[PDB]
Amino acid sequence: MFTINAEVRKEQGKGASRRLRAANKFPAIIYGGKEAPLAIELDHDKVMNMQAKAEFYSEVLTIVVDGKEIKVKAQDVQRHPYKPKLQHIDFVRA
Amino acid sequence: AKTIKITQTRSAIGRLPKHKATLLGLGLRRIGHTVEREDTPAIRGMINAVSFMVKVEE
Amino acid sequence: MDKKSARIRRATRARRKLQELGATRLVVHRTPRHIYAQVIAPNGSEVLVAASTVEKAIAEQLKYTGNKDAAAAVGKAVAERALEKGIKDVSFDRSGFQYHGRVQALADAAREAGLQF
Amino acid sequence: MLQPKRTKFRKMHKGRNRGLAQGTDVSFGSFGLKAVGRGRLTARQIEAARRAMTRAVKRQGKIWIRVFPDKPITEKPLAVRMGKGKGNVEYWVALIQPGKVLYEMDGVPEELAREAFKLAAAKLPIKTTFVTKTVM
Amino acid sequence: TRNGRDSEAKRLGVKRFGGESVLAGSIIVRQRGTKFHAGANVGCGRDHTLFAKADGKVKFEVKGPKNRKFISIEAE
RNA sequence: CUGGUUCUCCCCGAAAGCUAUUUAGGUAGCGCCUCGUGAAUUCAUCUCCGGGGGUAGAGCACUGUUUCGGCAAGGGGGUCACUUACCAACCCGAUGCAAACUGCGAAUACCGGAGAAUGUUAUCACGGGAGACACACGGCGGGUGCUAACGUCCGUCGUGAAGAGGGAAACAACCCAGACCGCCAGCUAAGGUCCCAAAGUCAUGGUUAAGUGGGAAACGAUGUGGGAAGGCCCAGACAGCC
RNA sequence: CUCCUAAAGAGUAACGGAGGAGCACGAAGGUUGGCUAAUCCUGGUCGGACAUCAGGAGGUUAGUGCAAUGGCAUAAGCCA
RNA sequence: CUCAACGGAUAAAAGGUACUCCGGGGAUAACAGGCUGAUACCGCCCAAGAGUUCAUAUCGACGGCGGUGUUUGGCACCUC
RNA sequence: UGCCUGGCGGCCGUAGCGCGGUGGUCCCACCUGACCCCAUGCCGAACUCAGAAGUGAAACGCCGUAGCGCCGAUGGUAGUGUGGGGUCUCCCCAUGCGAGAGUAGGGAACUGCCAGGCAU
Numbered sequence A: 001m002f003t004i005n006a007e008v009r010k011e012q013g014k015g016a017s018r019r020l021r022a023a024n025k026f027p028a029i030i031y032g033g034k035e036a037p038l039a040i041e042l043d044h045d046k047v048m049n050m051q052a053k054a055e056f057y058s059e060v061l062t063i064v065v066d067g068k069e070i071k072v073k074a075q076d077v078q079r080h081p082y083k084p085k086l087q088h089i090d091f092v093r094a
Numbered sequence B: 001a002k003t004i005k006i007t008q009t010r011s012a013i014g015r016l017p018k019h020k021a022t023l024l025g026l027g028l029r030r031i032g033h034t035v036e037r038e039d040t041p042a043i044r045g046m047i048n049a050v051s052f053m054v055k056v057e058e
Numbered sequence C: 001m002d003k004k005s006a007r008i009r010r011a012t013r014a015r016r017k018l019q020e021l022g023a024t025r026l027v028v029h030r031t032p033r034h035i036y037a038q039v040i041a042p043n044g045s046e047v048l049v050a051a052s053t054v055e056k057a058i059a060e061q062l063k064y065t066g067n068k069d070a071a072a073a074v075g076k077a078v079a080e081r082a083l084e085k086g087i088k089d090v091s092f093d094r095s096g097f098q099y100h101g102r103v104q105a106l107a108d109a110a111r112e113a114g115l116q117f
Numbered sequence D: 001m002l003q004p005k006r007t008k009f010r011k012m013h014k015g016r017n018r019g020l021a022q023g024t025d026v027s028f029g030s031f032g033l034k035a036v037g038r039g040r041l042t043a044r045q046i047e048a049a050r051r052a053m054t055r056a057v058k059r060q061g062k063i064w065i066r067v068f069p070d071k072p073i074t075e076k077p078l079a080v081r082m083g084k085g086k087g088n089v090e091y092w093v094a095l096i097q098p099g100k101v102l103y104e105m106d107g108v109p110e111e112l113a114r115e116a117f118k119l120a121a122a123k124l125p126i127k128t129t130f131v132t133k134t135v136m
Numbered sequence E: 001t002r003n004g005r006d007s008e009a010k011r012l013g014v015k016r017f018g019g020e021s022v023l024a025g026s027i028i029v030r031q032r033g034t035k036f037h038a039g040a041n042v043g044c045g046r047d048h049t050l051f052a053k054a055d056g057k058v059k060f061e062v063k064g065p066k067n068r069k070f071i072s073i074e075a076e
Numbered sequence F: 001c002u003g004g005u006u007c008u009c010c011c012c013g014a015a016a017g018c019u020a021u022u023u024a025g026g027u028a029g030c031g032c033c034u035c036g037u038g039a040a041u042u043c044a045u046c047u048c049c050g051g052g053g054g055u056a057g058a059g060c061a062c063u064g065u066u067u068c069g070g071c072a073a074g075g076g077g078g079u080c081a082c083u084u085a086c087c088a089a090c091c092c093g094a095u096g097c098a099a100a101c102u103g104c105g106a107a108u109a110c111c112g113g114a115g116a117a118u119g120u121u122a123u124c125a126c127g128g129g130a131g132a133c134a135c136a137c138g139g140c141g142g143g144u145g146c147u148a149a150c151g152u153c154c155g156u157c158g159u160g161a162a163g164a165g166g167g168a169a170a171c172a173a174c175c176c177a178g179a180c181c182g183c184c185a186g187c188u189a190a191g192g193u194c195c196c197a198a199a200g201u202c203a204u205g206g207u208u209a210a211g212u213g214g215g216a217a218a219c220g221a222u223g224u225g226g227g228a229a230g231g232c233c234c235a236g237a238c239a240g241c242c
Numbered sequence G: 001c002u003c004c005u006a007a008a009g010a011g012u013a014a015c016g017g018a019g020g021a022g023c024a025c026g027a028a029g030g031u032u033g034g035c036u037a038a039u040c041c042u043g044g045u046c047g048g049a050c051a052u053c054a055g056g057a058g059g060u061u062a063g064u065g066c067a068a069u070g071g072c073a074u075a076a077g078c079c080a
Numbered sequence H: 001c002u003c004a005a006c007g008g009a010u011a012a013a014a015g016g017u018a019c020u021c022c023g024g025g026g027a028u029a030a031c032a033g034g035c036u037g038a039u040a041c042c043g044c045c046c047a048a049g050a051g052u053u054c055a056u057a058u059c060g061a062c063g064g065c066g067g068u069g070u071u072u073g074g075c076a077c078c079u080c
Numbered sequence I: 001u002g003c004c005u006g007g008c009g010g011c012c013g014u015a016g017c018g019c020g021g022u023g024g025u026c027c028c029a030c031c032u033g034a035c036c037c038c039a040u041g042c043c044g045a046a047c048u049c050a051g052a053a054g055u056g057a058a059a060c061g062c063c064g065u066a067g068c069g070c071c072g073a074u075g076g077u078a079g080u081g082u083g084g085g086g087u088c089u090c091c092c093c094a095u096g097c098g099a100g101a102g103u104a105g106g107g108a109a110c111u112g113c114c115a116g117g118c119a120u
């Protein structure tokens, strides 16, 4: 079972997302269901270690944001073109 | 009505032709020149175009 | 290859021309059993007058409802129905049918009844 | 030496080599040699690196070549002045952007694949790295 | 063998863009084929030049079952 | 065609392009300069509105090109009608590439409309007088060349040309900035503040030991700082020794 | 003359990259009426990989007096 | 009118000059300098292989990265 | 007023294709006949005329169905105007604009005029 701590993003765009990745974080998104999509930030290296396990893309993960757990599944991942880094993750509500 | 004060902080030498036209549209003539302009979206658009070389005092 | 879709293809060119000219057209539809007639507004979406053999007001006075003399009745009827309405000059839209026989008998009958085209 | 069997035109513009690469993940095998640099790959360099890897694993498993030298490069001969038309085609290159997977390997252990890729990387003019197949 | 030939540019393209007011007879667009098609109050020359047949403002629309671009004159 | 062309001050102020030329270092019309006259809210900037794109990017249905797999026609060589070192169309799945590919598609730019503010009409027309038609470098987008050249050829902007001053040691074209005159006044820009040489031997926290700073690649390396994990380990690990 | 270079209006150079033209046609022009390809499969006298016939698939991959580009089903393609 | 040298100098026109001459040009070549470094030369990286065995005593393929300004060149910036 | 059909449009795939089902009083379609009007570079196939025995098989319409097509966010990414910067063949920062592809999802069209039938 994987649990992830996240914060809601204050602003979007190319300029904001690059500042996150310079601050050892990376954006993500949570959609699915009837709720509105939710843009979040994630700590990079901590999530980078979890995704190294094959069950990360198969089991159901919980993301605690504002102290609220959300059960999701990893939908799509945008990796760095040539570095062992993550750029973006799509989370779909389980 | 609501007016603002604009000051030119850098020189116009070597700027793009439409940047010199924007300064002429604001009435700025030289470095340190300060003008009074009506706070209008059309004026705000001119300031935004040459914001690198003007300083706005609201 | 249905005969209908091949007939709309035959009628498309004249209808585009009439639409470009902004003329009020007299559309004619012919079936093996019946014959129809409509006068469409220049915008092509309003039916001003109409007459056909499925109207019992005209069908009862005919031996057969789909022969040449039946078409002459609809041609006479649709013209006098349009003259009193105010339309005098129209453009005949054969609508893919050959200008011959029944549709020709419908046309000249309407032409005889005072419709200028 | 890889080369298009036929082409619509014989000579091409120099062009530029901006941007990042497409095909940035191992898609056929299990291990890959991903380019982290930018540059050109001549057909001879591709063949040289293939032979180095083919002999490294003693002709075992499967090897894919994800690039293909489809760009012709012209040169003017010596003692020739400027002008008088474009030069003649001398060799073919494949433009490489960072992240491009060049070779993929399968059917061999990882420790053997690293040495095979290391021997092949020494023949290429661009800096590369070792990558493995991941769960998308 | 040897290249080095070309032809004079023909100055094709749109002459009056959407919303422009034109007089009758004004050329709207020169084109090789009918990339644009004649709509209302617009004629098609023998070289498929679209010209205004009446005064008004030009108007670009995409209509028909093939999504073809039409040019018409909103008579004003 | 080369050379030379003699007193002063004031105002404005180019071009090295296009087109044509027995033309290419000439000349002509136009563009650009000046002077005069006339004329529209004419022009410019910004905001809003209406437009057409097919570039950058992307994509691979099309035109081509390309790799692998599947299905397999067929081509194969093998036996003489059998099964057989091999090559393999089409189709299907997956993966790339394109100035002369497009079922997509920006930013900008351009055309038109409306609206303020600002600008010594900055706009257009006609007339008098020209000069110029050898450009240079820098940035950006490209062709060419070797993504060689202070190379060459276009687009566009800037500067020089025709521009002094400050900076880059020196240094037309780079950075800052446009010199009406005077002052033994002040504030700043780029760039600087130990001495030459005007201004911090300034403050706080780090890094470097190479005079790195103060020239360079593939590649090589227990240099060193920071970070996040991992394996093993008092059920005794790592190193050494029996 | 056509395409690219040409930087999504126009225009834009090089002894840059590729091709064409110096005609043809009294019908291959006008109009009215009609018509809709390529390729392949199956079956079928001679007849064959490929002739004409029939059917299905296909959907313009065809066609356009000639280069390329843009067009073309209302056909600008084909027939009277 | 292939006035096609296609804005067409005449209706009508080829060559030599080391016997030469004048006006010019570093707007434009040959020598030398400069910029550049394809080429040349020198070095390095990888290590297939040769070396009885043994890649690295000595060599080193297929390829890769540099240095010098040194050959053949490129450019035409200085000097006609 | 509702259902159903025909004609003419709007719109131009969320509207198409496939698969399954379904409809004949009317309408439509096939159908019947063809000396004649007219027609076949041969053929009443088509076109045309005269009809109404038959049939909804085909076609067409309707209903269902997510097999395909099609539509399609949010976020990220690419690119890019202006200003600045670097290790300057390529990038980065500030700011503005911001795709394409793909993903969640949507989706078995909607609508006007007139006419006829049927129920009301």
Ligand SMILES: [Mg+2]
Binding pocket: A014, A015
């Ligand atoms: Mg940015």
Ligand SMILES: [Mg+2]
Binding pocket: none
């Ligand atoms: Mg002046």
Ligand SMILES: [Mg+2]
Binding pocket: none
């Ligand atoms: Mg004048």
Ligand SMILES: [Mg+2]
Binding pocket: none
């Ligand atoms: Mg591109």
Ligand SMILES: [Mg+2]
Binding pocket: F060
């Ligand atoms: Mg393709």
Ligand SMILES: [Mg+2]
Binding pocket: F024, F133
């Ligand atoms: Mg000249």
Ligand SMILES: [Mg+2]
Binding pocket: none
């Ligand atoms: Mg010149």
Ligand SMILES: [Mg+2]
Binding pocket: none
């Ligand atoms: Mg120039």
Ligand SMILES: [Mg+2]
Binding pocket: none
């Ligand atoms: Mg130069």
Ligand SMILES: [Mg+2]
Binding pocket: none
């Ligand atoms: Mg100095």
Ligand SMILES: [Mg+2]
Binding pocket: F178
């Ligand atoms: Mg001054």
Ligand SMILES: [Mg+2]
Binding pocket: none
């Ligand atoms: Mg001070």
Ligand SMILES: [Mg+2]
Binding pocket: F198
């Ligand atoms: Mg001092």
Ligand SMILES: [Mg+2]
Binding pocket: none
């Ligand atoms: Mg101190």
Ligand SMILES: [Mg+2]
Binding pocket: F214
């Ligand atoms: Mg040093």
Ligand SMILES: [Mg+2]
Binding pocket: none
């Ligand atoms: Mg253009």
